[PDB]
Amino acid sequence: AYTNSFTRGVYYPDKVFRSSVLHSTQDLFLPFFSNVTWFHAIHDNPVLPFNDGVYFASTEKSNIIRGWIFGTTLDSKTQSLLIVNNATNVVIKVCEFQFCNDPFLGVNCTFEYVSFKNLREFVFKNIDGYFKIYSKHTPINLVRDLPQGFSALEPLVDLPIGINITRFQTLLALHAAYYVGYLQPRTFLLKYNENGTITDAVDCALDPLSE
Amino acid sequence: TKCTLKSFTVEKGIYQTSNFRVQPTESIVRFPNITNLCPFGEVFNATRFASVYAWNRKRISNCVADYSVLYNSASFSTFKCYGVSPTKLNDLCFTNVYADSFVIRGDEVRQIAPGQTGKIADYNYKLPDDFTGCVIAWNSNNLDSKGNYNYLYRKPFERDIYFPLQSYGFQPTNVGYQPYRVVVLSFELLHAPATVCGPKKSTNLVKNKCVNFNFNGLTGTGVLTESNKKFLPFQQFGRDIADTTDAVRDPQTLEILDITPCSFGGVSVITPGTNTSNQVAVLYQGVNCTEVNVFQTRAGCLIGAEHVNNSYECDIPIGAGICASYQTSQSIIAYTMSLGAENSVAYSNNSIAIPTNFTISVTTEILPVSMTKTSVDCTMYICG
Amino acid sequence: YTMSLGAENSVAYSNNSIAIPTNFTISVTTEILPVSMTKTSVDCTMYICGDSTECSNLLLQYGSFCTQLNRALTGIAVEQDKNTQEVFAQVKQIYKTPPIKDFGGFNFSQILPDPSKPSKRSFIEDLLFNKVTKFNGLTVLPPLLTDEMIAQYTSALLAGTITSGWTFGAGAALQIPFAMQMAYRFNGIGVTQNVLYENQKLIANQFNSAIGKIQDSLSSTASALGKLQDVVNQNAQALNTLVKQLSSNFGAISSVLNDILSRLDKVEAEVQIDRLITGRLQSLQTYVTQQLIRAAEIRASANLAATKMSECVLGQSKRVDFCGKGYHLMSFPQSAPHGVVFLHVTYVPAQEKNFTTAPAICHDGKAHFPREGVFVSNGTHWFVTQRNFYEPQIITTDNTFVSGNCDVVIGIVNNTVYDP
Amino acid sequence: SALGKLQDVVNQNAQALNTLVKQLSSNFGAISSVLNDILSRLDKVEAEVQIDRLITGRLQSLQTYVTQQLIRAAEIRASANLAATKMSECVLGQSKRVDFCGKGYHLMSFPQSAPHGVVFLHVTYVPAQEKNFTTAPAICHDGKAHFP
Numbered sequence A: 001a002y003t004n005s006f007t008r009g010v011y012y013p014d015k016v017f018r019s020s021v022l023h024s025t026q027d028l029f030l031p032f033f034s035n036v037t038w039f040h041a042i043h044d045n046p047v048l049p050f051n052d053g054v055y056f057a058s059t060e061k062s063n064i065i066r067g068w069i070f071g072t073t074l075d076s077k078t079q080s081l082l083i084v085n086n087a088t089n090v091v092i093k094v095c096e097f098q099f100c101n102d103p104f105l106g107v108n109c110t111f112e113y114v115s116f117k118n119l120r121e122f123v124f125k126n127i128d129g130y131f132k133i134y135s136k137h138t139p140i141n142l143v144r145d146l147p148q149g150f151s152a153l154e155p156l157v158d159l160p161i162g163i164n165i166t167r168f169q170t171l172l173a174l175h176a177a178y179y180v181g182y183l184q185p186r187t188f189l190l191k192y193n194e195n196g197t198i199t200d201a202v203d204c205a206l207d208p209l210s211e
Numbered sequence B: 001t002k003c004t005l006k007s008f009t010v011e012k013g014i015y016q017t018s019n020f021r022v023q024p025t026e027s028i029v030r031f032p033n034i035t036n037l038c039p040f041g042e043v044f045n046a047t048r049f050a051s052v053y054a055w056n057r058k059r060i061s062n063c064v065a066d067y068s069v070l071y072n073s074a075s076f077s078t079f080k081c082y083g084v085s086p087t088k089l090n091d092l093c094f095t096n097v098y099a100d101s102f103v104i105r106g107d108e109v110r111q112i113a114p115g116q117t118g119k120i121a122d123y124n125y126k127l128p129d130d131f132t133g134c135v136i137a138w139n140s141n142n143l144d145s146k147g148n149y150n151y152l153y154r155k156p157f158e159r160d161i162y163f164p165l166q167s168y169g170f171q172p173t174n175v176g177y178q179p180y181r182v183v184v185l186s187f188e189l190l191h192a193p194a195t196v197c198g199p200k201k202s203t204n205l206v207k208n209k210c211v212n213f214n215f216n217g218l219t220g221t222g223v224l225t226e227s228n229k230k231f232l233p234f235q236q237f238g239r240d241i242a243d244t245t246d247a248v249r250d251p252q253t254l255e256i257l258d259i260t261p262c263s264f265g266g267v268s269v270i271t272p273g274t275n276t277s278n279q280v281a282v283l284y285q286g287v288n289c290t291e292v293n294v295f296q297t298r299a300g301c302l303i304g305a306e307h308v309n310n311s312y313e314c315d316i317p318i319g320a321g322i323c324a325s326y327q328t329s330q331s332i333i334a335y336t337m338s339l340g341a342e343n344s345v346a347y348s349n350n351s352i353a354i355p356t357n358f359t360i361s362v363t364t365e366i367l368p369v370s371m372t373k374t375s376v377d378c379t380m381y382i383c384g
Numbered sequence C: 001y002t003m004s005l006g007a008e009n010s011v012a013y014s015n016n017s018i019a020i021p022t023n024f025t026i027s028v029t030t031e032i033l034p035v036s037m038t039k040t041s042v043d044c045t046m047y048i049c050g051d052s053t054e055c056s057n058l059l060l061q062y063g064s065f066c067t068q069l070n071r072a073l074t075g076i077a078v079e080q081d082k083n084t085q086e087v088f089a090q091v092k093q094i095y096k097t098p099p100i101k102d103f104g105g106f107n108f109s110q111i112l113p114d115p116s117k118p119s120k121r122s123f124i125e126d127l128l129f130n131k132v133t134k135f136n137g138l139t140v141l142p143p144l145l146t147d148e149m150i151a152q153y154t155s156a157l158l159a160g161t162i163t164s165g166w167t168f169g170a171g172a173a174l175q176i177p178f179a180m181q182m183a184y185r186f187n188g189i190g191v192t193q194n195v196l197y198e199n200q201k202l203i204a205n206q207f208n209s210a211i212g213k214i215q216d217s218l219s220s221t222a223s224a225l226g227k228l229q230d231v232v233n234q235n236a237q238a239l240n241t242l243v244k245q246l247s248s249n250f251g252a253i254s255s256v257l258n259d260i261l262s263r264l265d266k267v268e269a270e271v272q273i274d275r276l277i278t279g280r281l282q283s284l285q286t287y288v289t290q291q292l293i294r295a296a297e298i299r300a301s302a303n304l305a306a307t308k309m310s311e312c313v314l315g316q317s318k319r320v321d322f323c324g325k326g327y328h329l330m331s332f333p334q335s336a337p338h339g340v341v342f343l344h345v346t347y348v349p350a351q352e353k354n355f356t357t358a359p360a361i362c363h364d365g366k367a368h369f370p371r372e373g374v375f376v377s378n379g380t381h382w383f384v385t386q387r388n389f390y391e392p393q394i395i396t397t398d399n400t401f402v403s404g405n406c407d408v409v410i411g412i413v414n415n416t417v418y419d420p
Numbered sequence D: 001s002a003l004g005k006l007q008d009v010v011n012q013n014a015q016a017l018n019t020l021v022k023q024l025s026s027n028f029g030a031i032s033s034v035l036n037d038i039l040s041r042l043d044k045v046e047a048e049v050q051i052d053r054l055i056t057g058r059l060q061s062l063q064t065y066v067t068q069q070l071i072r073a074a075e076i077r078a079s080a081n082l083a084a085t086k087m088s089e090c091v092l093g094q095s096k097r098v099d100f101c102g103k104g105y106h107l108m109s110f111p112q113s114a115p116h117g118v119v120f121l122h123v124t125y126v127p128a129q130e131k132n133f134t135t136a137p138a139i140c141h142d143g144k145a146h147f148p
Ligand SMILES: *[C@@H]1O[C@H](CO)[C@@H](O[C@@H]2O[C@H](CO)[C@@H](O)[C@H](O)[C@H]2NC(C)=O)[C@H](O)[C@H]1NC(C)=O
Pocket: A072, A073, A164, A165, A166, B155, B158
């Protein structure tokens, strides 16, 4: 299944304050009005391609989705980034795992690290071996699907792992609605208000008016 | 004014002779208040360096780095740096530093650079083409040769664990055939709060005064002030339209400082001709007199001219309705210009004025019509 | 679509037909002109090498580029004051209006000063001032004349124009009653002055209503100021371009010059800094070249505005379509940000009758010709009348002059001529 | 100081040439501004790097001068078209154009030559000694309104 991304998936491109200004930036972004693939883990945890980078989201009330796996082959022949959220902690490893036959959470580790009503949005990308993560949490007024309205994600993490990633998967809690979109290299014109905050954007390649 | 015009005679007028800038009173140094010494003395003494097919990366973080301990050492066969000069490493600072630590054949040290190529740099140690850091290496024949056959070889920072897997045979009798230990320091300037900085001490902070600041190795000069620029918690600096820094967060106390550049302006000199007087007045354009007879015009602080309460024709222009002249008791005066004598025309619905007489005036008007016909032989001008 | 050039009109010409306007409309047409632009100056050394000695010592190797750029911007900055002086300072004395405004029913209260204001602008000058809207070594110098001084000059020019006709331009101002000034201005367009005095209330009401429409036009339609607002926008766009070019790398490791001087030691750094100097200097030469060419366009507009002030405000113009559409009567100047606005007052003829006409009239052998105006017929009778307003008069030896006889002239007509 | 406009056009051109000549003394980042130093001190593969800096600088300096002279020549041409218009309307005619042909009502103008320019002696009638009078737009005779 599919749905329209609308204007979702904008994020602060760098750790720099700017205000009352329209800023042109080129980066991996989710294209405006692209189609996110959609999933329903009832009565749905496949391995996806990673492409250049991933936007990811879920619409929530019970927090079933709790992690991700990334790599080339995910089968102990090479290192593979595991990301887990476990009740309060975040736990991250790159070990040469052979994962479960059907990866879920029960209700050479060269790098390791530690730290519906809700929509939670994430972006993952790899550049020069730096795995970067951005996110946002928000309430939603529409229960059924992604809201046709604007908000932007902020950075949380950067992992200097150097590992090749071309595939990924997501992890579910057992004794669920989630979305995936692919980033592309796009020029975005970003509107910053008085308060350091991105309030609107133009994906310049979308249509001739956006150009 | 004479030196500006390249002349001993100066005509009556106003001349921009120089540009004034308020000088920084003192320097301000603001590094994070962190005190651990960095672990480089461990890295350069590690018991077993990695094979180059499987090179180790150590994250240096949360520490103070005296790079002189490395750079002064007699050990290193090379210390080449590609985005920084090694003399500056104690003054500059970083979010993290990554040490890539491994062993290679001495001939192959040539492959470790930005933009270089060859079988290591292709298969198992590609640097970024914009590599911002230093390659530190030395001959390790006496440490690592035996032969010894353990040292195996096969995008930027690609790790890739018949097939291409092979090892050097390091006997101590091997010179370019010998093992070399190499540590490549890659520096994370890419923005966040700094956590790897040189041993240079922080001063106290100063506000509301012109100072030569340095925050985490961002040097500059300006008037620092508390500000309503409400940074989001991840943001470390704010940038102007010019990409010059416009606000900062102090790394020891997380308040946001506006940076405004120190006051500056053109130094106009107002003069009657040298063929009249040697007295002059100075207009510091746009500058407030508290930042420099003295008189605040709307055009700038004016010095050496008397403000006069009358008004006259504009003899030498200044700006914003102010003009100046040299007048008797002789001195330069500055005054609001008179636009002309005021005249209530004697109008009423049945009065007319008719001239009973005339004057045949003659008024000269002068117009340029041509200018000196130059020609330049561009090859003789350029090449002689 | 293929554009249409205008409505299509076969004019009803024939060898004996003339159309004469039986009535007029006084029209007031606003013309807006740029006169100056913001007096910028850039300290080229602080733009290129801001607060670095290490960069400034390299910039001295480029010789007198920096000083001739500061000279070129200073030449532009001074000629903005010259332009502003030439447009407004055409009046030798600050004339001021009588206390009582007995201008024969004409009502200048919307264009004359209002003493209620903090700067003594008129009502229409306030609309114009409402509808029209950098630490990197950039600076803005003030104009030599404040907007209050420009409002004193537009007040003086206007108070002269109202109380004294053209006379305040040519010599000492002579008072003349405003109805009699307009009567001269009607003779100036070849309309016999009794056409004013017989219609003075109508002409005053047309003028007062036309001034009223200017306030509604300027209040509703901000795009009318487009010439002045574009001069502001072009200068802001040029400065924003000049400033954004500081952020460009030009092939150096970083455009922020303090990065180069903190990261690199002198013999490594000077190679990088010379790229920034070369790029920034070429960018500043580009800005100064654009400003010199733009300043020449503003000077052409200021010379035109000064010419309109001289010929159109201080006088009455015979130059067709120079002083707005229609036959010109008079113009009132109004100040605006970096410009001037003329309210050109003009006579437009408005209600035609077709008539039969003739070049001459045969009386007894003699061919009579009109002294001024044209011979015209309503079909049964022949009248002479002035060219620009239908006013039939009996044909007489006072209205006409003889020359030669009937045999010489093509299309002459027989009629009596009354000899008073 | 009456000749100020003509003396200024002479000064601007002399100032431009003296600037263009003095730029030959500038290094532009070469090891000397005297081209014979480079050619007497260096062999060609070394020298051509230095000479290319002088060529780039001197050529950019000459492009700047020619750009100034093109813009200045347009200013002088606009003044020459104004002077030609004054000759045509003001000398060869009499002008109704208020304040075009000197202050006052224009009678005639005499041209006189000057270095790089022209000077017009505009002869103008200026009215000079008022009397006040009571006035009227029209006069009643026997019922008829008479106008002048
Ligand atoms: C990341 O892994 C993929 C495989 O999942 C690599 O793709 C192969 O690259 C080789 C050349 O090195 C090609 O000959 C193969 O055809 C590719 N295989 C597939 C299935 O596409 C990729 O090169 C790796 N990238 C890095 C930087 O390690």
